[PDB]
Design a protein around this ligand. Structure first.
Ligand SMILES: [Ca+2]
Ligand SMILES: [Ca+2]
Length: 917
């Protein structure tokens, strides 16, 4: 018995008392059934036989049959596919399988689906018609659901928006849909709605729900005319009042609302919904759903009003839109962030259309009332959670998402402040006012969220102001709302508040609007004691301490003049924070300078130094002390670097680098032009230890930077006397110079040439020799792409400066005369972007030995250009310039010499794309 063999195999596989080889036989048997060309035939019999065979078995038969069907062709295996269908369709009309294990229904669903996918359009024209004919006659709901889970299996194989597409799957799937649309779609939909209604009244939501499942799935490829009917709308909407059905009902309607129909058509459905919503004056997922529903409509109505076209429908549209306003709010102001965000699009799409419509800025009392209602909501939603604390956590806390929902909300505010500024101001002012006031009603422990709100709103309230017209008027001197706020804030006990977030914010507000204190200076003393407060620069919070430093600086920088009487004290307070304890950390198993510096608030601590510098240099502290203090900071960092480098084998690299960087930013703290000084003597004492510091261990590319960088802003202070010693740096620096640093040296001299244009020259001619010797070599040899690009562009630029800075003549000196020729030639060789610079260069040398020869030699470069757009112009630009300096011979040498080596030369000598074409 071919069947009995299958049953013994399967049964062998499930009996756990069977040996491994025996079981092997079975398993191997069952497996063959899928590959062999005879096997599947066996199964075609077994499966339809209920009383003799067990589900255990049939299932495996059904499974093998599917895999067979799935792999067959319509032409090669057509006869076969049909033999099966008839046997399955017969096994289905039976209606005896639903009473068996659910895996045999599901197993069948799958085959039926697969079978359908291959012969339905042409070979199985009565698929749907026959399935529906069965339901009306059997009256067994279990079958109605079967039929539905099928229309659902079919729909799964037919559409998707996934990226894994295939031109074949799309075309095959497209044909099935196209086939369903023209042949059975209209009845499927009619039959579905029918039982949906029926079962609906049967208070039998078990099926009514599968209908909704399908509806929403098939909505995409369902014919529009079939989905516009209202009775079906009125039906789905009624399900809303029902619990098991309402989530299905709401998701399905949203689907119908998104169906991309024509403007004239969408508005009719949207009215059925709109009307139904109007006359209907909780759970969370429901609300997330209803919200999505509303959001969907809203975004539709609004998208439609933009390209309007009747005159009536134009109205209708705006009316439906209006009636959704109470809902847009009712959900925007929801307690659950998820429900609120469900409506942001619509809100956004809407305020954008409103911004366009505020053409006359005439506000109707309804727009007014609406926009207020909207802010009530946008505001409520910007506040931290009153019943929920916050975390310092930077990577996995929900804050990032909160700060996002804030970033959006703020934009809404902006757009509303755009739509109407008075309304925003008045509102935002009250808003900030009360919260603060209310905050006064709460212990500091529960008052922060509220204060944090007000300080945030304040902070963003006025992010685009730059001049006096912002804080106070010009004639009346009446202060804008902004400052009334700032006055208030400044006069609050916000400073005394211990919550970090509030301190930070406060200090940010104080800095963003520092210019304000130039009008109302009173708070100055209180504000500085604050920045130097145990909440300011000494704040314990690992997240605010570093920020405060930056900020302190920024504040001290904007109110430099106002703090000259606070100089002594404040400096004293910064002593501890000027210390350095850099410890090295590291995803990668290894440490580095970068990883180490980041793991420490050094980049922020530099600002602290630069600030001491401002304090010392602008605090009218007598020069007798300002020399004492500056000397005390400089030698303190210097003495530490010396002590370390003076006793141990060369984590001091980091310590040197940073000690280097310290001095550098300390320099930045001081003024850039050096009328006598006392901080000048100290700076001289400074580079001796740096040269002491470079020559001892000046191997790291980083110290290279730090030290180079140090001169850049050190010699910027008292630059005249320093230009003389830079020569020694070029030597030590150019000795160990690598491909990457030779460029940073040109820039160093280049940026340097700008500062001391007149007096840098004599030391320049010394460098050019050692520099150019290094350059020609580096340009002639894992870093090829690196050096080439970096050296190509720096050599190009350095020559340019030297020419305009008036350094040419200096390069004719003894040391340069040996290189003049190659430097000039090499420019010719250099000759898109690079070519452009080189031609400007050759023009620089020209306009500003071998000079005449190089001039002629430029001539061939103009004809050599087309052998390969702006280059072409700058080319005939140098050529145009050529004539002027050489005059009468220049053209005379081109007529006699070049022309000879008749119409192009004619036209040319008179004044390329033509010569090229
Ligand atoms: Ca869902
Ligand atoms: Ca929230």
């Amino acid at each position: 018995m071919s069947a009995q063999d299958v049953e013994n195999a399967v049964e062998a596989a499930l009996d756990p008392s069977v040996g491994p080889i025996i079981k092997q036989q079975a398993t191997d048997f069952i497996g063959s059934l899928r590959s062999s060309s005879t096997g599947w035939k066996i199964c075609h019999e077994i499966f339809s036989e209920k009383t003799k065979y067990k589900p255990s078995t049939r299932l495996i038969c059904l499974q093998t049959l599917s895999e067979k069907v799935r792999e067959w062709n319509n032409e090669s295996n057509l006869l076969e596919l049909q033999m099966i269908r008839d046997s399955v369709w017969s096994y289905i009309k039976e209606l005896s399988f639903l009473d068996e294990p659910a895996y045999i229904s599901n197993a069948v669903q799958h085959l039926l689906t697969l079978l359908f996918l291959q012969l339905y359009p042409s070979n199985w024209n009565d698929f749907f018609a026959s399935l529906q004919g069965v339901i009306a006659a059997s009256s067994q709901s279990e079958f109605s659901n079967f039929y539905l889970k099928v229309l659902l299996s079919i729909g799964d194989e037919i559409a998707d928006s996934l990226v894994l597409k295939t031109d074949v799957q799309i075309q095959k799937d497209n044909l099935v849909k196209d086939a369903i649309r023209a042949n059975d779609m209209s009845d499927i939909v009619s039959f579905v709605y029918e039982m949906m209604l029926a079962y609906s009244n049967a208070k039998n939501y078990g099926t009514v729900g599968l209908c909704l499942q399908v509806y929403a799935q098939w909505v995409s490829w369902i014919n529009i005319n079939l989905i516009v009917n209202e009775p079906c709308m009125n039906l789905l909407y009624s399900f809303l009042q029902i619990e098991e059905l309402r989530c299905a009902a709401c998701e399905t309607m949203t689907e119908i609302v998104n169906k991309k129909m024509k403007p004239l058509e969408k508005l009719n459905l949207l009215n059925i919904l709109n009307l139904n919503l109007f006359f209907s004056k909780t759970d969370p997922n429901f609300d997330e759903h209803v919200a999505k529903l509303i959001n969907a409509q809203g975004v539709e109505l609004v998208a439609i009003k933009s390209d309007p076209s009747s005159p009536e429908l134009k109205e209708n549209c705006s009316f439906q839109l209006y009636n959704l306003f109470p809902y847009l709010i009712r959900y925007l102001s929801d307690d659950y962030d998820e429900t609120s965000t469900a409506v942001f699009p619509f809100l956004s799409d809407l305020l954008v259309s409103l911004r366009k419509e505020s053409s006359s800025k005439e506000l109707s009392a309804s727009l007014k009332e609406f926009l207020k209602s909207l802010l009530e909501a946008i505001i409520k939603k910007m506040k931290y959670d009153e019943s929920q604390e916050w975390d310092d956590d930077p990577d996995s806390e929900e804050e990032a998402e909160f700060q996002e929902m804030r970033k959006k909300l703020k934009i809404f505010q902006d757009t509303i402040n755009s739509i109407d500024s008075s309304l925003f101001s008045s509102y935002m002012y009250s808003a900030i006012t009360s919260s603060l006031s209310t905050a006064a009603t709460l212990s500091p422990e529960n008052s922060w969220q509220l204060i944090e709100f007000a300080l945030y709103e304040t902070y963003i309230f006025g992010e685009g102001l730059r001049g006096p017209d912002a804080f106070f008027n010009e004639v009346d001197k009446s202060p804008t709302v902004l400052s009334q706020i700032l006055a208030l804030v400044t006069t609050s006990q916000v400073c005394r508040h211990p919550h970090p977030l509030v301190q930070l914010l406060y200090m940010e507000i104080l800095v963003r609007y520092a210019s304000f204190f130039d009008y109302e200076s009173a708070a100055i003393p209180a504000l500085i004691e604050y920045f130097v407060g145990p909440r300011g620069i000494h704040n314990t919070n690992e997240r605010v301490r570093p920020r405060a430093w930056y900020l302190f600086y920024r504040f001290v920088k904007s109110i430099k003049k106002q703090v000259v009487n606070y100089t002594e004290s404040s400096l004293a307070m910064l002593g501890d924070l000027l210390n350095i304890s850099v410890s090295p950390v590291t995803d990668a198993p290894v440490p580095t300078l970068n990883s180490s510096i980041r793991n420490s608030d050094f980049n922020s601590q530099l600002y602290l130094f630069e600030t001491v510098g401002v304090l010392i240099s602008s605090g009218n502290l007598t020069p007798e002390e300002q020399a004492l203090y500056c000397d005390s900071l400089i030698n303190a960092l210097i003495g530490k670097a010396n002590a370390a480098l003076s006793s141990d084998l060369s984590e001091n690299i980091i310590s040197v680098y940073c000690s280097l960087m310290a001095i550098g930013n300390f320099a930045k703290g001081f003024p850039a032009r050096g009328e006598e000084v006392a901080w000048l003597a100290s700076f001289n004492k400074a580079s001796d230890e740096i040269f002491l510091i470079l020559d001892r261990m000046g191997f790291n590319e980083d110290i290279r930077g730090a030290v180079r960088f140090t001169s850049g802003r050190i010699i910027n202070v008292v630059g005249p006397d320093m230009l003389p010693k830079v020569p020694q740096l070029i030597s030590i620096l150019l000795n160990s110079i690598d491909m990457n640093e030779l460029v940073d040296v040109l820039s160093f001299i280049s940026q340097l040439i700008h500062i001391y244009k007149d007096n840098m020259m004599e030391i320049t001619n010394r460098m050019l020799p050692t520099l150019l010797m290094r350059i020609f070599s580096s340009l002639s040899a894992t870093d090829d792409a690196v050096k080439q690009n970096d050296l190509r562009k720096s050599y190009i630029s350095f020559i340019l400066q030297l020419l305009n800075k008036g350094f040419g003549s200096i390069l004719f000196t003894e040391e340069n005369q040996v290189y003049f020729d190659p430097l000039i030639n090499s420019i010719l060789h250099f000759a898109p972007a690079t070519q452009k610079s080189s031609i400007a260069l050759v023009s620089k040398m020209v306009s500003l030995a071998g000079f005449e020869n190089f001039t002629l030699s430029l001539t061939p470069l103009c004809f050599e250009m087309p052998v390969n757009l702006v280059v072409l112009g700058e080319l005939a630009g140098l050529q145009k310039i050529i004539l002027e300096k050489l005059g009468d011979i220049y053209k005379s040498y081109l007529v006699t010499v070049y022309f000879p080596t008749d119409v192009m030369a004619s036209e040319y000598l008179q004044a390329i794309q033509a010569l090229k074409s």
